[PDB]
Amino acid sequence: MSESLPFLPRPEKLDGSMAGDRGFDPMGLSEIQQDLTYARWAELKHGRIAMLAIVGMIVQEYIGVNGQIFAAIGCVELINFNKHYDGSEPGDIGWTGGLLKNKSEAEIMKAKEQEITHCRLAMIAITGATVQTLLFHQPLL
Amino acid sequence: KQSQALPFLPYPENLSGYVGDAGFDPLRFSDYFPMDYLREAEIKHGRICMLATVGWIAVDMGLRVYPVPAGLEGVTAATAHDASVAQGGLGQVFGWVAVAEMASWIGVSQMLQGSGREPGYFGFDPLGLMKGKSEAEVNNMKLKEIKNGRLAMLAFSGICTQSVLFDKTFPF
Amino acid sequence: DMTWEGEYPPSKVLGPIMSKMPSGLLGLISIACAAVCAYSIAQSGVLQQQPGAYENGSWVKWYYVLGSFGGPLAWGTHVASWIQRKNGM
Amino acid sequence: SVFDNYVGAKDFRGAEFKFDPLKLSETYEPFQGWFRESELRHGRTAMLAVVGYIATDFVRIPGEMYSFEAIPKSADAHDALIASGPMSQLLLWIGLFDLVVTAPAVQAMGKGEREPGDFGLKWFAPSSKDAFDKKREAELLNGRLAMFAIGGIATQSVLNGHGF
Amino acid sequence: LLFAGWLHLQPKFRPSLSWFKNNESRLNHHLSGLLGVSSLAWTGHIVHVAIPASRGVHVGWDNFLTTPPHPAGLTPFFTGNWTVYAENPDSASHVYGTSEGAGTAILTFLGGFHPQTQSLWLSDIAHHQLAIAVVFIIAGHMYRTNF
Ligand code: CLA
Ligand code: CLA
Ligand code: CLA
Ligand SMILES: CC(=O)O[C@H]1CC(C)(C)C(=C=C/C(C)=C/C=C/C(C)=C\C=C\C=C(C)/C=C\C=C(\C)C(=O)C[C@@]23O[C@]2(C)C[C@@H](O)CC3(C)C)[C@](C)(O)C1
Ligand code: KC1
Ligand code: KC1
Fold first, then answer.
1. Do the Cβ atoms of A35 and A86 come closer than 8 Å?
2. C87: closest CA among C2, C10, C19, C5?
């Protein structure tokens, strides 16, 4: 049975091999994909953008410049276009500062586990931070 | 071969497991509907009413949340539904019941196609209470849930009708 | 699978619920759905012509809309009652 | 062949009385189990009805809605209690009994696993089946007589207006 | 749509032949999502955008979150008091595109034409599209998918 939903069977492609695998696929979206490589690429990228959008909304009131950010992200996504379709490791484009050469693959897995839990948290947070900005129009408080 | 609750009607024959069985079912809904669905519906009707009859009794016998939010000040249990949907309140309760019921629907749907899930089984047992119990003792506690649930279904329906018809709060 | 021969289909074409129901129970359900639909149509007719109960679609009641859909349920349950009777229930 | 399948071919003197002039038990031979379950149901209803008309004409239940001032003899107990509630209360519970108990009972009778008239009151029921068969014809004869008695009482109390 | 045609020819995204033969899941989605949800969404446009624009009110992307399309504002929908959305239609002397003579009803069954434009009432089209939406959403619950 699934870890996250114990009354559900474990999804077949959600064995404990990727980071963040809580067995959470109730709708069965992973049954039709051949691999979860492209979906992890999209989960990490949505989370890394949401992590920058959380801090970008903090430092916007606690002090088109963002047109240079979309032009900078677009250059990174253009040069690493084939990596989403090569079949390579999801999220890895070699943008590490040498820290990722480190302890063994159990520690590499817990680094990926720390990223994907920060990825999943900031997507909930930037959904919350932008909705209660559009409704109440307060910065904070 | 004969029903226990009605010893002139035959036994309905689809109730052979199912710990709360009296052989009762005269209209034989167990003959026509799946018993995994029927027990899941009886259990869910039971534990909803167990919370509901305790929540109606508590609200009628004083006991507001403190401090009381705006719009729920002079309000009994028979008028707390519409007052809470105007305050907010039940709108958030409906949102989180919906994501629980949509996820449990995949549990009910996979139970009726196999999967070996017991009706009325979620993972929810955080305080232990089943640490290696025998199946004669597990089935006994499941009987206590169905019996107390069957009582609170008839109780809440008595409380909600009498509080609105005779227009009183729960110590009538 | 669901192909059949002769004068009547087998019980299994009624689905997994009504294939096990008696023909007399499905027959009485059908009259109950027909009477609820006929009551819902007749009462929505008298709500249309009542001069204080038709404005802005106030003649539309949820229980009369839901009751009027007993019409196609009365058709199907009386067809299903015939199939169970031909199959010996 | 209803006289060999069922019991009750007697008269008021105890002689053998094969009474089916219209031959309904041969014209409607599948219905003769229903015919006995409904003869007993008509019989057991009319025996409580004849007692409940006589006992009403002397004793009421002690409420003011049921009192002698409200309902004069016994014949106004039906119409002057429709909107009051007690006629709606018995209409619910008898109709709930007939939907939940009696209707599964008459389909188990047609399937052949219960006897017609049996609703499980076997405490004072004797064994040695002929002794039980003698109790059933006593139920039938007192039942068939009460079906004319409640016809006589409720008709004569309207055209003549007298009590008892 | 040009990227998706390129993408669904790549070897990891080419759908299997069984996905193309799944008749029950395609009809369920195409009755619900393609037909019924789009008709519900088009009811969302003409209630929020088109019927205020015929009533002389500008509702665009700049102000549609803070401007309700009805004065009662979505509480008669959830309470089941749906006759509030048909209370006052536009008059027989409503100047189209202006607020003069203009009603506030968003779902009517008026019938016939707006007398100035000689065209259908937008509140009738909204109640048409909403009723078409519900019928098709229901119709997309017929066929046996995974559940
Ligand atoms: C045919 C059956 C029958 C019916 C329809 C009535 C109807 C009535 N009775 Mg009468 N009654 C009956 C039999 C019946 N009685 C019998 C057999 C007796 C002798 C015990 C009485 C003695 C009686 C008195 C003293 C009074 C009435 C009164 C009345 C009136 C209203 C209140 C009431 O229901 O009394 C309550 C019913 C009783 C006291 C009788 C109890 C029922 C007996 C024991 C048979 C029931 C057994 C059976 C297994 C129950 C199954 C129920 C089922 C739903 C599960 C009402 C018109 C009242 C009145 O004022 O009349 C105007 C009143 O004061 N009845
Ligand atoms: C809003 C009301 C609503 C309700 C009660 C349902 C209910 C259902 N849908 Mg439907 N769905 C809806 C709206 C709704 N849907 C709409 C507007 C569309 C676009 C038309 C769909 C598209 C759709 C498809 C394509 C399919 C279903 C299916 C089903 C059935 C799944 C059975 C089950 O237990 O699944 C297990 C549980 C789940 C899958 C979880 C989701 C269940 C919820 C109710 C659906 C989400 C509805 C809505 C978008 C969310 C808001 C509602 C509420 C929670 C706030 C169930 C009857 C399936 C079916 O078998 O139909 C015959 C199916 O294949 N639905
Ligand atoms: C809800 C989810 C959903 C949605 C929105 C769609 C949408 C679409 N899919 Mg589908 N698809 C889905 C799920 C979905 N799909 C699923 C789950 C499967 C697998 C089972 C498929 C498998 C699939 C395949 C294989 C194909 C599509 C295609 C399409 C496109 C259809 C062509 C078009 O654009 O016209 C949309 C038309 C409209 C919005 C207007 C409808 C106009 C008609 C004529 C209206 C008439 C009916 C009217 C209301 C009533 C009749 C009038 C009466 C009085 C006579 C459309 C984008 C095709 C495509 O083009 O892919 C690129 C295609 O080849 N799908
Ligand atoms: C033994 C026992 O126990 O009992 C016995 C008793 C008894 C009686 C003797 C027996 C019998 C014979 C029976 C039961 C015969 C019953 C026949 C029966 C009951 C029914 C046919 C309906 C036909 C049509 C065309 C209906 C609707 C058709 C339509 C198109 C609609 O309603 C349209 C509509 O819906 C919508 C689309 C939109 C709504 O807004 C408006 C309306 C409402 C207009 C049995 C079988 O022997 C059982
Ligand atoms: C985890 C995400 C989450 C957030 C972020 C959140 C936030 C707020 N909740 Mg909610 N809520 C749940 C989850 C969350 N709530 C859950 C799981 C339930 C049980 C189903 C639930 C039930 C209720 C009820 C009954 C009420 C309620 C309220 C508020 C209000 C308090 C403002 C304050 O504290 O000053 C703020 C916005 C009250 C209210 O005022 O609603 C207008 C109110 O009466 N909540
Ligand atoms: C077990 C659940 C149950 C409840 C909860 C309940 C409640 C009430 N019954 Mg009912 N009742 C039964 C069951 C139940 N009754 C049964 C099994 C029968 C035999 C078929 C039956 C028959 C009668 C008769 C003849 C009368 C009657 C009434 C009332 C009324 C006030 C009672 C009081 O306070 O003394 C309250 C609502 C009388 C009345 O006042 O009607 C206006 C009245 O005359 N009942």
1. no
2. C10
Tokens describing residue E58: 């500008």
Our CA angle for E54, E34, E32, nearest 5°, is: 105
Ligand 2 pocket, mutate which of E141, E144, E146 (most atoms under 8 A from CB) = E141
Residue E22's alpha-carbon distances to A127, E15, E19, E27, E143, in angstroms, are 35, 11, 5, 9, 11
B4 alpha-carbon distance from chain centroid: 24
Helix (H, G, I), strand (E, B) or coil at A137: coil
**With the C-alpha atoms ordered A123, A129, A131, A134, is the resulting torsion angle positive or negative?**
negative
Omega cis (within 30) before E69: no
- Joined together, the tokens standing for residue D56 give 């009403």
This PDB structure is determined at a resolution in Å of 2.4
Q: Is the CB of D24 under 6 A from ligand 6?
A: no
Report the separation in Å between the CA atom of C69 and the middle of ligand 3, taken as the mean of its atom positions: 29
Which three-class secondary structure string do you get for B104-134?
HHHHHHHHCCCCCCCCCCCCCCCCCCCCCCC
| Elucidation technique | cryo-EM
B59 with B171: CB under 8 angstroms?
no
- Give the Cα separation of A27 and E137 in Å (integer): 20
On whether the CB atoms of residues E96 and E114 are closer than 8 A, the answer is yes
* D96 CA closest ligand 1 atom index: 54
Question: CB of A134 within 8 Å of any CB in chain E?
Answer: yes
The residue count for chain C: 89
